[PDB]
Design a protein around this nucleic acid. Structure first.
Ligand SMILES: [Mg+2]
Ligand SMILES: [Zn+2]
Lengths: 308, 585, 397, 98, 74, 248, 235
RNA sequence: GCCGC
């Protein structure tokens, strides 16, 4: 009953600019599909970006290197814009080492196994002195969105040495997207529309692959709508009461008074517990004396009590 | 103790009783509560363990904090507390950040704006204090101001603009004469893009009336309206008439309709209606896309001609003065009058051009409707600005001088859309400096006056039910020459009559003695020709150490009569001293 | 505290504080200067016959009260004559139209009545006086950002404010640039101007990240690349909030004027996440913390790495001398300087004797008073500037 | 005080000697002068000149009795207005009955 | 959740007495020796007492008679 | 867009410089975008120099006489590479650009002369009904941040005299509940909140500990007392020749 | 980690009467609530197959403005009534019905002739309370299935005004969706806090309960993308 | 004192 769009006439203006076309569309579906695809593509598209940089002789971002024109902060800012592609890995390490005179670019980054630099003219530093050397190690990770360098705390689980410089990660290859709806050339049908999506990336991701990823994300999200339906903690407690090494005389009394766990012991006040048969003033103090050794004063107030 | 402070921002998603509390500002005010809940649940036995665990801020600590904030109200106040509405109790909502999110509808009561203000947060840590914060100082409790009786929580600015732009009519637009089965169809037509918000159509509308004794009756008919008004009709509660929607709603109809909803239905339908009004106003104001440009300030074409004529006239009177038949004072006064007349004519021409600028054709010939100019829309709707500011923006800036109180002879003939010369700007700096210096130096006088009033009236409390005195004072509408300032309705509403009210027909009793006048009684009195009503006052209560609940009329904050134990002297002092910061001395 | 008709070319009628001190604190105009006796002056152009001359006279408040002073924005022809017969003038604290021959002086320029702060507001004549006052007073509270950005719509006073302030580094005998670096510029002065003997070069040591009075950051970065000829007075490095020698204390933001779902209600501002990502409006703040070892009767105060009753985790970020390593990131209540205060005990009771036997010779008698980071303060350790007295042993660092 | 006059006259008029009752002429005072004449010396000493108010109170040997809002705030009790109105009503009946 | 306390106010109309009534009911239901007479929906004792007042089964007089009954029982 | 502001703040505050600067920044960034686009396509130096010369000669008889004829080709290349992000034009204080010059500057860069374009809602995809004024405005960042303005306290240190909490941040002080706030509380009728403010939270030395112990236990009971400040005042007045006492 | 997106769990449906429902789905990753809700609303409100009355024929006067013979209710109100009646026709593209009545009493939709294929969900719906006092009305309507909402701006059917007078140009409301509105709220899961909660408030005229309509709209929208998700599928 | 409301 409903016509289906098909990806036809995929065209690439430049390394970054590109166009994608879907020829057959119904009366109102063009704008819905265009806006959904634009939101999905701008929001969540995977990519790889620089995570941290480790330069040879520097210690912090607010320092300077003798022989280079820029500060380390501007070096990190330049490295933040590096565009790479990695196949089969998510934690590649890109080593760089160059000495001499003039600017250094991404071209002189050491050729890794499967690592592609889409733009090999990206200037990241300037060397001014003849006998000056630079050497860094760049870690590139694959991600989905914007992750600040301060929010990640799990990286502090293992101690990090003094000299590792953390940069922010963007992970999004897509920078600009527009779409238009035009009248289709199909005359046998009454009135059909066509969709043309124009996107500007950093050259990391293919247009067709991006469209497929966005459509798969949308379909996986929509899968849920097609079927709606739906219409005492501290280990010191909950231990056996025969762990306090009490007297024989109190051992019989606790059984009669239905005290079997450490926890139920601590919920009894002095006034009423003394009324229990044959406790004894001096023997009761020994129960308090032993429970004091564990730090649990007599008379605590808990909320719930499971059988175990 | 248990006090915090940070910068406030705006939260449009909030309810009238909710505020946004940062979770770092929390977990510090509620520390002992978290300790108690940790020790009670068994997570930590000793106080040291709970203290250390809160120090380490684990996840279960956040869970327990969320559990313990559940129904504990918190109260926010702003530093210059001028009246009792400057401190109110809300229900905190945990947000991530460092700024407090304040509901926009309470900003007018707080006199708060989001350009760098701060508030203070206090925790009412007692059952009695919690009940007092919930049942007395909640933001939903105080909706009418306790100084005049008008609503204090009223939509403003962007909400007013959204309501105004929503309920307008255009001569020709998408859809004309369409018949719609209900408001839902109008909303569907607008959302689908098949019609316009300002298109004129006919829609079946069902009304409700409270005419029966405590009973609601129905009424349906075909009414002539627009699409936007039909869409708005889905928000108003049942029991209200449709005449309150079929207007433009320029910040003065919306307050009146809120007041009618309060006086007819109650308190909770009123708060629900206010929240829904704010939501729909913000939504449609964002949808409109209203913006201000440099072409919105249109300058009248005849302004240059009027300027030239005025210049010729002052040249003529200067020549006449040079002839020697006029002294300095007479020519000075005549020049001032002529320039004032020229300014008035220029302003009138500019306003005439700005009012009905839009000339849009119709199905037959062409007509002239109210302009859709954005600046005129924001002025007429009352959202922001007035006529004088528009005259300064587009017409003549006018005559001004305050070096010592005199007036410069030559005026400023250039507005702000055009440039101002060096001399004209230097002249306007006089008024700017005087105004700012006056503003900075009257607050001390206002504070001293408020202190004296509060102290002289601190020990006054309603301590009796009815004194029983026959005394009173004479109430007549305030007249002054050929103008009227206060009708009897405003001066007698919510007052207890000391003597029986007689109609011009003799021996006819309308309302008995010792009765409370309200909207129905005031309307019945206005139907007849009553002119003077004898009402008792507090200066004739004759009771010792207090004031009777009958000699003092109904409290303005709540419709009912005032109850015993209400400190009225402090309320009166704050009501009198809250202005004065805006009194020009 | 009221503006006077004599405040025309001497003090600014716009720039002034708001609440307490309005009218009591003022700012000098751009061209105003102080007479020999101590009175304010302002320049004017002499007018002879009907042509304005180029010679400039400085008039005080008393002298200018007699003459007729024309307006800056009055049109003139090629030869200097007034293009219209009747021109606006100030005669004695007033404003009126005079003949083309009755004038005596003319204003030098249109900025004569505004200070430096108010000169940087484009379209000042289109703003209300008090709101422009607030804008001028708020322009001085800006915080320099990470990267400078010139204003697209400026005034032309940015160069003067940047050069005259002294934050930049300006060449004084500029020749050609020889060696460039993030912290130094060495310029080979040309032969045309040169002090005889010993040849000569110019060495500029830029000031890197340095704490300011308001705990902001002060940093200088070069503008010349290499071998680039420079002249005298050219800018070599631009200090805080300066781009290529132009005052740049803000950033160019793309703006839409529209209501958006109540998130810009009242005076609030709605900001995209892309502004956050590009690190615009990100500023560096620097803090200074100091500790002093001061002598006591019971003994001297020592700075040592080993702190009694302190775990090994706390000493991880301390060197062999007890001073943090440069670049370490400290948060919360970490220890910066390990300092120990001595305690007094000359009576060796048996319990203290066995305490000394079981543990170290001190047995932790010496109390610890170490410089710890205040709570809520975090950042990277930049510099350590240990100072020592004469005679005392030199610290390892 | 007017209230003392009205109370005293009513007691005198209730008894046989009704002619004992004294006529009075009401006075008008400013908000600054009617505040310093209050019968509670704890108030009117927290508002304006305190050396003069305390000096006159010390000589006369008067008492406060804490009958208003400001006195209870200083000594940290419940104000006799609002929710605390009921509590202050109970305390007065016990004093009357002993 | 009692957002507005209008009905509870009208049940015992002073806007000042119901604060005391709810305070004493909350003391009974929190300190001990009492249980709610309305279904507990994970709400605090204050709003539970407010809901009990609104439902028409809590007021000062019945509180006093229950207190007298418990006093006479012991 | 990067920033969204309210049109409601323009007319009442009377800032037309806002709108004029917005339009002028839009024109300047349009010229900068033209230069950047023409540099992107590796266009020859002649056409770029022609465009820059045309842009630098605009206005109605301005006094600037910048010419590219005497400019070296490398100098032209560097200057053009410096105008990719925008053309930094300048307007003096009391004389500068007018509406006509701004409009022709807009027309040079292929932008609408009205200064308003069609915006689409990024959430709904629908177009806003009216055109919206878009441009570039120079925004600063003031020195008032919430990292220095956020504070909270539950218990801390108190002064030896009057035993009340300290004041201000960096001492962990509490907010001051001044006289007007107490007037407002009295006008509300909140007597228990006021009493807990005056005694338990500030000066009742035993009351503070008792109320904290009750809160930890979960009692929510007050047990008030006598503020230390009244005792200090009594000792002060008694230190003169005047006797004041609390009779029974 | 990557490529894994949050999925809603514990969907809550609040059934109101028999045609009004409110559906809450949570959690949703930030910015997905708006996308899903807007796509669903657009599909449901602009393009949904359905059937509605598009033609009327009243014996006698045939003009758009009529004296109505005095039937206590104007013919425009008659058109407004017959517009809103919901019909579920089974297996027939177009069918024509007729209603005749007499004897003082309201004339409901049930008084129309009953056909096996048609299923009037609102037969108690009163078209008119008969002629004032006693008289007869005879009228024949026609129904057909279409898509979305098609206003009667023009007929462009048959020739001249024969089809208009035979239909009177009643607006066609094919899609059985009276009103749909969605609201996006903030929801949190564990440490994360920037997650969206989608609340869909939907009403339907009849012949369809709301959740089935939501399911149908989701089905068509998701099946539209099978040109891109078929090969790129997990299973 | 300087600044913010
Ligand atoms: Mg403000
Ligand atoms: Zn009375």
């Amino acid at each position: 009953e409903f016509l289906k769009p098909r990806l036809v006439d995929i065209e690439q203006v430049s390394s970054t600019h590109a166009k994608v076309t879907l020829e057959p569309l119904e009366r109102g579906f063009g704008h819905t599909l265009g806006n959904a695809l634009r939101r999905i593509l701008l929001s969540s598209m995977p990519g790889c970006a620089v995570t941290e940089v480790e330069i040879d002789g520097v210690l912090h971002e607010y320092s300077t290197k003798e022989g280079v024109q820029e500060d380390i902060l501007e070096i990190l800012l330049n490295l933040k814009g590096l565009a790479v592609r990695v196949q089969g890995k998510d934690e590649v390490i890109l080593t760089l080492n160059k000495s001499g005179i003039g600017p250094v670019t991404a071209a002189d980054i050491t050729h890794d196994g499967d690592v592609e630099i889409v733009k090999p003219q990206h200037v990241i530093c300037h060397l001014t002195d003849e006998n000056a050397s630079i050497s860094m190690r760049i870690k590139v990770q694959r991600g989905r969105g914007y992750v600040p360098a301060s929010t990640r705390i799990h990286s502090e689980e293992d101690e990090r040495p003094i000299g590792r410089l953390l940069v922010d990660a963007c992970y999004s290859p897509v920078e600009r997207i527009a779409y238009n709806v035009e009248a289709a050339r199909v005359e046998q049908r009454t009135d059909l529309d066509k969709l043309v999506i124009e996107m500007e990336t950093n050259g990391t991701i293919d247009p067709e692959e991006a469209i497929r990823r966005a459509a798969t994300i949308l379909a996986e999200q929509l899968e849920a709508f097609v079927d709606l339906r739906d219409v005492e903690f501290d280990p010191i407690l909950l231990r056996p009461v025969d762990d306090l090494e009490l007297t024989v005389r109190s051992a019989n009394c606790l059984k009669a008074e239905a005290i079997h766990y450490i926890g139920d012991l601590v919920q009894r006040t002095e006034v009423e517990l003394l009324k229990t048969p044959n406790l004894g003033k001096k023997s009761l103090t020994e129960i308090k004396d032993v429970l004091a050794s564990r730090g649990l004063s007599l008379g605590m107030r808990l909320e719930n009590w499971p059988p175990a | 103790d248990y006090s915090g402070r940070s910068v406030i921002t705006v939260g449009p998603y909030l309810r009238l009783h909710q505020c946004g509390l940062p979770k770092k500002m929390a977990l510090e005010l509620f520390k002992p509560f978290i300790y108690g809940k940790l020790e009670l649940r068994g997570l930590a036995t000793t106080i040291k363990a709970a203290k250390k665990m809160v120090e380490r801020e684990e996840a279960v600590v956040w869970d327990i904090l969320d559990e313990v904030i559940r129904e504990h109200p918190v109260l926010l106040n702003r530093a210059p507390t001028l009246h009792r509405l400057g401190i109110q109790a809300f229900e905190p909502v945990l947000i991530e950040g460092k700024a407090i999110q304040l509901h926009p509808l309470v900003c007018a009561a707080y006199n708060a704006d989001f350009d760098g203000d701060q508030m203070a947060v206090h925790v009412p840590l007692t059952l009695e204090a919690q009940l007092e914060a919930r049942a007395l100082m909640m933001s939903t409790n105080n909706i009418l101001s306790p100084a005049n009786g008008e609503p204090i929580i009223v939509p403003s600015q962007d909400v007013v603009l959204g309501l105004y732009y929503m309920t307008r009519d255009c001569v020709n637009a998408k859809g004309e004469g369409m018949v719609l089965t209900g408001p839902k169809e109008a909303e569907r037509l607008y959302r689908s893009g098949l019609a316009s918000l300002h298109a004129r159509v006919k829609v079946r509308i069902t009304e409700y009336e409270k005419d029966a004794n405590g009973e609601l009756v129905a009424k349906t008919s075909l009414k002539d309206t627009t699409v936007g008004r039909a869409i708005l009709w889905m928000i108003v509660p049942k029991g209200l008439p449709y005449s309150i929607v079929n207007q433009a709603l320029g910040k003065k109809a919306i307050s009146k309709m809120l007041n009618t909803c309060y006086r007819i239905l109650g308190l909770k339908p009123t708060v629900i209606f206010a929240d829904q009004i704010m939501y729909t106003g913000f939504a449609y104001a964002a949808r409109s896309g209203a913006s201000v440009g440099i072409d919105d300030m249109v300058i009248p074409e005849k302004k240059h001609e009027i300027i030239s004529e005025a210049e010729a006239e002052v040249a003529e009177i200067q020549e006449q003065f040079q002839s020697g038949l006029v002294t300095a004072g007479e020519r000075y006064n005549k020049v001032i009058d002529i320039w004032a007349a020229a300014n008035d004519r220029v302003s009138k021409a500019m306003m005439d051009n700005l009012q009905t600028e839009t000339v849009i054709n119709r199905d037959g010939q062409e007509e002239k409707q109210v302009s859709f100019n954005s600046i005129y829309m924001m002025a007429d709707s009352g959202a922001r600005g007035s006529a004088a500011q528009i005259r300064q923006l587009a017409g003549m800036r006018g005559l001004m001088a305050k070096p010592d109180g005199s007036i410069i002879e030559t005026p400023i003939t250039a507005n702000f859309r055009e440039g101002l010369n060096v001399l004209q700007y230097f002249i306007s700096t006089h008024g700017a400096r005087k105004g700012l210096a006056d503003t900075a130096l009257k607050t001390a006088n206002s504070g001293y006056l408020t202190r004296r009033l509060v102290d002289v009236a601190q020990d006054l409390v309603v301590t009796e039910d009815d004194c029983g005195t026959h005394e009173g004072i004479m109430m007549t509408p305030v007249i002054e020459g050929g103008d009227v300032k206060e009708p009897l309705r405003d001066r007698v509403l919510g007052r207890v009559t000391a003597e029986d009210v007689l109609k011009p027909g003799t021996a006819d009793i309308l309302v008995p003695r010792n009765t409370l006048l309200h909207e129905q009684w005031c309307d019945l009195l206005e139907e007849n020709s009553v002119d003077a009503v004898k009402v008792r006052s507090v200066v004739s209560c004759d009771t010792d150490f207090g004031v009777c609940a009958h000699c003092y009329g109904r409290d303005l904050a709540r419709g009912h009569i005032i109850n015993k134990g209400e400190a009225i002297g402090v309320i009166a002092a704050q009501s009198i001293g809250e202005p004065g910061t805006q009194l020009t001395m | 505290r009221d503006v006077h008709p004599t405040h025309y070319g001497r003090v600014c009628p716009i720039e002034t504080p708001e609440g307490p001190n309005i009218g009591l604190i003022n700012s000098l105009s751009v061209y105003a200067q102080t007479n020999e006796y101590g009175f304010l002056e302002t320049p004017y152009r002499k007018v002879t016959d009907g042509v304005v001359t180029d010679e400039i006279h400085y008039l005080s408040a008393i002298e200018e009260g007699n003459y007729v002073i024309a307006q800056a924005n009055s049109n003139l022809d090629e030869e200097g004559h007034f293009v219209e017969d009747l021109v606006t003038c100030r005669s004695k604290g007033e404003s009126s139209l005079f003949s083309r021959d009755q004038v005596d002086y003319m204003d030098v320029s249109t900025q004569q009545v505004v200070s430096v702060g108010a000169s940087l507001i484009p379209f000042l004549e289109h703003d209300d006086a008090n709101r422009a006052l607030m804008g001028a007073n708020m322009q001085r509270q800006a915080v320099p950002t990470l990267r400078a950005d010139k204003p697209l719509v400026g005034t032309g006073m940015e160069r003067a404010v940047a050069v005259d302030s002294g934050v930049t580094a300006v060449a004084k005998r500029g020749g050609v640039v020889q060696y460039v670096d993030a912290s130094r510029i060495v310029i080979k002065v040309n032969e045309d101007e040169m002090y005889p003997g010993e040849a000569g070069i110019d060495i500029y040591n830029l000031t890197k990240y340095t704490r300011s009075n308001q705990n902001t950051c002060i940093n200088q970065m070069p503008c010349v690349s290499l071998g680039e000829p420079v002249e005298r007075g050219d800018v070599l490095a631009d200090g805080p909030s300066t781009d290529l020698g132009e005052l740049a204390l803000g950033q160019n933001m793309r703006v839409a004027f529209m209501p958006w779902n109540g998130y810009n209600f009242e005076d609030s501002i709605l900001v995209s996440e892309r502004v956050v990502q590009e690190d615009r409006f990100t500023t560096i703040h620097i803090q200074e913390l100091a500790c002093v070892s001061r002598d006591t009767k019971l003994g001297p105060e020592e700075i040592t790495a080993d702190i009694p009753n302190v775990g090994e985790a706390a000493l991880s970020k301390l060197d062999e001398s007890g001073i943090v390593y440069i670049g370490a990131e400290v948060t919360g209540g970490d220890i910066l300087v390990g300092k120990v205060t001595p305690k007094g005990e000359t009576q060796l009771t048996p319990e203290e004797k066995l305490l000394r036997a079981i543990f170290g010779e001190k047995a932790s008698d010496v109390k610890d008073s170490s410089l710890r980071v205040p709570n809520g303060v975090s950042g990277t350790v930049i510099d350590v500037q240990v100072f020592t007295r004469d005679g005392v042993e030199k610290d390892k660092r | 005080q007017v209230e003392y006059s009205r109370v005293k006259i009513a007691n005198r008029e209730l008894e046989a000697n009704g002619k004992v009752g004294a006529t009075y002429s009401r006075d008008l005072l400013g908000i600054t002068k009617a505040s310093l004449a209050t019968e509670s010396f704890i108030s009117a000493a927290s508002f304006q000149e305190t050396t003069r108010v305390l000096t006159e109170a010390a000589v006369a040997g008067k008492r406060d009795e804490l009958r208003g809002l400001k006195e209870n705030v200083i000594v940290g009790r419940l104000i006799p207005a609002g929710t605390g109105y009921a509590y202050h009503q109970d305390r007065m009946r016990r004093r009357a009955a002993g | 959740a009692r957002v507005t306390v209008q009905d509870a106010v009208e049940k015992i109309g002073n806007r000042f007495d119901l604060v005391l009534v709810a305070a004493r009911r909350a003391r009974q239901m929190q300190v001990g020796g009492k249980d709610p007479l309305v279904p507990e929906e994970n709400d605090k004792t204050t709003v539970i007492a407010l809901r009990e007042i609104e439902e028409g089964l809590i007021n000062n007089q019945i509180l006093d008679v229950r207190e007298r009954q418990e006093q006479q029982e012991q | 867009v990067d920033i969204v502001l309210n049109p409601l703040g323009v007319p009442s505050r009377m800032n037309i410089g806002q709108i004029l600067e917005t339009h002028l920044g839009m024109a300047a960034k349009g010229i900068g975008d033209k230069i950047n686009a023409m540099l992107k396509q590796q266009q020859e130096v002649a056409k770029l120099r022609e465009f820059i010369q045309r842009a630098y000669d605009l206005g109605a008889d301005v006094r600037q006489k910048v010419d590219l004829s005497t400019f070296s080709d490398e100098e032209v290349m560097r200057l053009a590479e410096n105008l990719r992000k925008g053309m930094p034009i300048a307007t003096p204080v009391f004389d500068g650009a007018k509406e006509a010059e701004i409009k022709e500057l807009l027309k040079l860069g292929d932008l609408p002369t009205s200064g308003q374009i069609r915006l689409y809602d990024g959430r709904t995809g629908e177009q806003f009904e009216r055109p919206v004024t878009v441009g570039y405005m120079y925004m600063l960042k003031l020195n008032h941040l919430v990292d220095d303005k956020m504070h909270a306290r539950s218990t801390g240190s108190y002064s030896l005299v009057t035993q009340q909490p300290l004041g201000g941040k960096a001492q962990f002080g509490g907010q001051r509940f001044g006289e007007m706030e107490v007037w407002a509380l009295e006008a509300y009728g909140a007597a228990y909140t006021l009493q807990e403010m005056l005694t338990v939270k500030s000066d009742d030395v035993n009351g503070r500990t008792k109320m904290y112990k009750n809160i930890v236990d979960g009692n929510h009971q007050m047990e008030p007392g006598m503020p230390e400040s009244f005792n200090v005042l009594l000792k002060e007045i008694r230190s003169l020749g005047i006797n004041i006492e609390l009779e029974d």
